[PDB]
Write a protein that binds this ligand. Structure first.
Ligand code: HEM
Ligand code: HEM
Ligand code: HEM
Ligand code: HEM
Ligand SMILES: O=C1NC(=O)c2c(NCCCc3ccccc3O)cccc21
Ligand SMILES: O=C1NC(=O)c2c(NCCCc3ccccc3O)cccc21
Ligand SMILES: O=C1NC(=O)c2c(NCCCc3ccccc3O)cccc21
Ligand SMILES: O=C1NC(=O)c2c(NCCCc3ccccc3O)cccc21
Ligand SMILES: O=C1NC(=O)c2c(NCCCc3ccccc3O)cccc21
Ligand SMILES: O=C1NC(=O)c2c(NCCCc3ccccc3O)cccc21
Ligand SMILES: O=C1NC(=O)c2c(NCCCc3ccccc3O)cccc21
Ligand SMILES: [K+]
Lengths: 155, 155, 155, 155, 155, 155, 155
């Protein structure tokens, strides 16, 4: 079904953000696992899987709308060097992601692509849940101290 | 069954205390959850539900006694701004509630409303267990330190 | 995540409506139970629980958006003196509630808070289901007679 | 298998009657549900489902006989404005339907299309069962009074 | 609940489209079954059932909004004379249906009938899935050849 | 219970047709199996069994009517040399059979042997279902091509 | 555990190949699903998952050897425009990948990193199995014809 060209461009921009997030979260996960922080490793793994599922739905929607999904261009990974920085890098990426998602919904609404809007709204709900998780972790570090925070994410 | 007017007023006062406690504990629970202190959030949720059940029984007794249950007037909620203050706020509320319960039981005994007395005694037992919980948490904060106390209430 | 100040104000207004509804439906429920109209009592009890669940979600969303949920201010309960009046009072509250939901949805849409909009839309769907129920009961009283209507809600 | 042209014309007339009945009964069902008369709504829904199944068998038979099933022409729906009129409108439609079935069976017999006759006989048995139901409901309204009758069909 | 008069007109227009699709898809299904293409027949039967379920939700919404559901007027069925034409007739119908759905959603949004919008968005999601199915089938006929395509839909 | 002489002659003519069809379908079944077209062979096998059960019911009715069932005379088997001819030979036989069934039913009706008519009507229904199967297979061969048709009947 | 610098460079080169393959196979899979070739889509999906699992193990080994896994640099995807091209693009990519694997194994052997060698050998076995699958599919296209090959991958 021939989709709106700018919708397809917005979907490819969202897709591009998810592809960054897939790799950043996967690498952060395996770093935390290598350091023995396996509760962080596992949670971050599940965050990377969630982004994979979002990218899948985006690819499927783009193809249905008769566009070409861009899996070639990978933007800049934000990789931290310690736990606090890694959480903050994930948070910075998610804040960029939700900004782009909102702008994409505005345009879907304007050209009456209500099904694409519903898909992006669902993704936005998942990203806002990730932001909640990230902000909460960063706050816990301040409340319990870094050493306790890390201790609590070993097992 | 026509109840004693002053018994009904005592029951409405106790109901009023429960209505404050329902909201105060519910808000505290959701604050703790938002901060990632989910074991405190879950416990405080169950405290709120318990107050809801007490309020239900008070409403039912008042109606049986042909009074009007007062769900309109809501007293002052005592909301803390950190874990220590929230616990102390709950405790201050509970100490007021048990003082009022004792006065109501005296009156029920004087007018021979022994069934209303039995209900209030059951509520008093629940409120004293809540006091025990609260005093114990505040004491644990002193024994293990605040960071450890919060750490133990994350998951 | 820093939410829009006016969205938070709208969410607190919706929450305020739910807090009224909780108490009004709960009292109407216990009145109907006291009168032996237990099917009305049971249905109104479940209406009150539904509003409790909506209030919970509103409170959680407000805190996530870094606002303060208002559980202190309780508006005017509309309590009837007989079954017909009680249902109409519920219906009057629900019509106020849905007007406020529609205005809050408008504002969420305009600041691109599409997750808050989706939550409010779900709550609006529940409120229109309650309106349907309430309108239908009032119509049934006219079709079958008050004595039959009440008879069918004894057990 | 090449069927008798006039048989196919009869079958399309019966089909036309079923198509009216599908819509008439389905609308009556949903009107009754909207009014809170859900037992009436459920029974009328099952009547609509029955006509749908008859229409299916007629379409299949017409196609086997190398005719064209007519699903384009929809005759006049008879919609009541109250329970009594709706039942009478169903009954009036059924009495026309059984007259057309009898005339179709006469013709199937004359041209030795014994299988089409057997199908129509089965449909006629169903329509007579519906006539029994409808006459019985209209009689019950007289024996128990409209208010009781409707009361008995709320749940 | 007093609905917007123009929302109700839109809902009756969408319902009119569903009524056409019910009949068109049911006839196509029984044509394919008669021809021995039972996988197509079964798939098209389920499409017809999906439209029946949409029509039901539309009728119920219109009645709740205090409008009259129009089941009397039936627009033009697009019936093909071979498999390729039947799929293209279905696709042409669906493209008109989704155009009308978008226009209806615009109006629901403008008068704040967000529940009607939600129902129409769900239907649109179902219709776009049907468009995907149909476009894919017509593409497969080109890729594998008509003879193979029909072979794969016999059993 | 002594039957009408000419009814018994009709039943014996029908029985004679069924005896031809038993052997013709059984041989066709085993030819297809020998050729590796086992799905055709299995379906034709079940057609032969169907005719065996019809013959059984005819034999039992003739004996009950105190006639002698003719299992001695076997008319001409129509054996094809390839799939299309075999199906056409089956169809030609079925069309003679249904013509004979119709004449027999006319006579049963004239002499008021309604039970024999009902048995012949049931057999006629099965024979018209076989005609449908055969016409449909001949149509599929045209639509998917003989090679694909046979391919789909190998396993 | 401090790894050989050149081993880690080899491991990142193999990882880069896996990252290309993940994306190329995932897109090919979703292209085939969009075209209705679901069996090709599902098989290609499992190939993409396989490469994801290989990339994970390489990431984990690089980190253990105290190197930095390179998830930032993504080489050129080879995307076909039809089924034959897509299979040949996959095969071209696999043949480059196995050449790189062989060179990395040579170097692991020379510096006695026998566990890295074993990991790469396991990956090489999986890639040779993919080469087997792809060569076989391309030959089947020649043996059964493209239309039959695609027909067999519809369901
Ligand atoms: C750095 C790149 C990637 C890595 C290391 C990776 C890793 C993984 C792993 C380890 C799994 C679990 C497989 C299993 O054991 O079942 C997985 C699943 C999955 N991946 Fe990826 N992946 C990557 C990129 C992608 C991309 C780009 C996509 C889509 C565009 C994607 C889509 C999926 C899907 C749909 C699943 C299945 C999730 C489920 O339903 O369980 N992945 N991935
Ligand atoms: C008059 C004030 C209230 C009364 C009498 C009341 C009463 C009740 C009762 C009797 C229950 C059932 C508990 C059980 O399982 O035994 C309940 C459940 C619940 N209440 Fe309340 N409640 C009140 C106010 C509130 C408020 C203000 C909130 C939220 C802000 C709330 C949130 C909940 C929730 C989330 C549940 C459980 C729902 C579920 O289990 O699905 N309640 N309430
Ligand atoms: C106003 C038009 C119609 C409406 C609103 C409608 C509605 C429905 C609904 C709600 C169902 C139940 C679906 C389920 O839960 O599985 C159904 C089933 C069905 N419909 Fe319709 N329908 C309509 C017209 C038709 C027509 C014209 C036909 C055939 C000519 C038809 C044939 C069927 C059949 C065969 C079933 C399956 C019943 C069963 O075996 O359970 N319908 N319909
Ligand atoms: C060429 C002549 C015939 C052949 C090759 C034949 C073959 C068969 C076969 C292979 C079976 C299945 C047996 C089993 O269950 O293992 C069967 C069943 C049967 N046959 Fe025949 N048959 C022939 C003629 C007849 C005749 C002339 C009659 C009656 C007049 C007859 C009546 C039956 C019946 C009643 C069954 C049982 C079917 C059931 O109810 O499952 N058959 N036959
Ligand atoms: O990342 C990428 N996404 C793409 O679509 C792509 C390429 N496309 C070639 C045409 C793919 C195509 C052809 C026909 C029909 C539908 C189709 O989808 C090439 C390189 C990299 C990328
Ligand atoms: O918080 C409140 N509690 C109440 O009872 C109430 C009101 N009463 C109206 C008559 C309640 C009533 C009428 C008839 C028989 C028994 C009854 O119990 C009004 C406003 C607020 C409140
Ligand atoms: O209803 C209320 N909601 C709040 O957040 C709150 C307060 N805030 C302290 C931090 C203080 C009092 C009452 C309330
Ligand atoms: O309601 C309707 N019923 C119909 O058959 C019909 C139409 N016919 C197209 C030819 C259907 C057909 C074509 C070829 C072979 C066998 C066939 O069966 C057109 C419009 C409306 C209707
Ligand atoms: O297709 C049709 N849809 C309709 O509603 C209709 C008719 N209406 C009669 C009054 C329906 C009605 C009456 C009282 C209360 C509520 C009501 O809803 C007449 C003919 C055809 C149609
Ligand atoms: O197919 C057959 N059915 C039978 O009943 C039958 C036979 N019966 C012996 C009675 C012989 C008989 C009875 C009445 C009148 C004339 C007669 O010559 C013998 C061979 C074949 C068949
Ligand atoms: O694709 C990439 N792979 C990487 O490692 C990487 C970056 N490294 C930051 C340091 C990660 C690190 C820090 C301390 C200790 C061990 C560590 O492992 C930066 C950008 C992109 C990439
Ligand atoms: K083939």
């Amino acid at each position: 079904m021939k989709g709106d060209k700018k919708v397809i461009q917005h979907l490819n921009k969202i897709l591009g953000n998810e592809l960054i997030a897939i790799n950043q979260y996967f690498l952060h996960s395996r770093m935390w696992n290598d350091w023995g922080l396996k509760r962080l490793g596992a949670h971050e793994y599940h965050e990377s899987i969630d982004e994979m599922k979002h990218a899948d739905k985006l690819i499927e929607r783009i193809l249905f709308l008769e566009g070409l999904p861009n899996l070639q261009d990978l933007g800049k990974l934000l990789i931290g060097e310690n736990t606090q920085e890694m959480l903050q890098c994930d948070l910075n990426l998610e804040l960029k992601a939700t900004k782009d998602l909102r702008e994409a919904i505005v345009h879907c609404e304007q050209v009456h692509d209500y099904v694409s809007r519903d898909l992006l709204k669902d993704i936005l709900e998942s990203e806002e849940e990730h932001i909640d998780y990230l902000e909460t972790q960063l706050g816990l570090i301040q409340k319990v101290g870094l050493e306790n925070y890390l201790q609590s994410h070993m097992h």
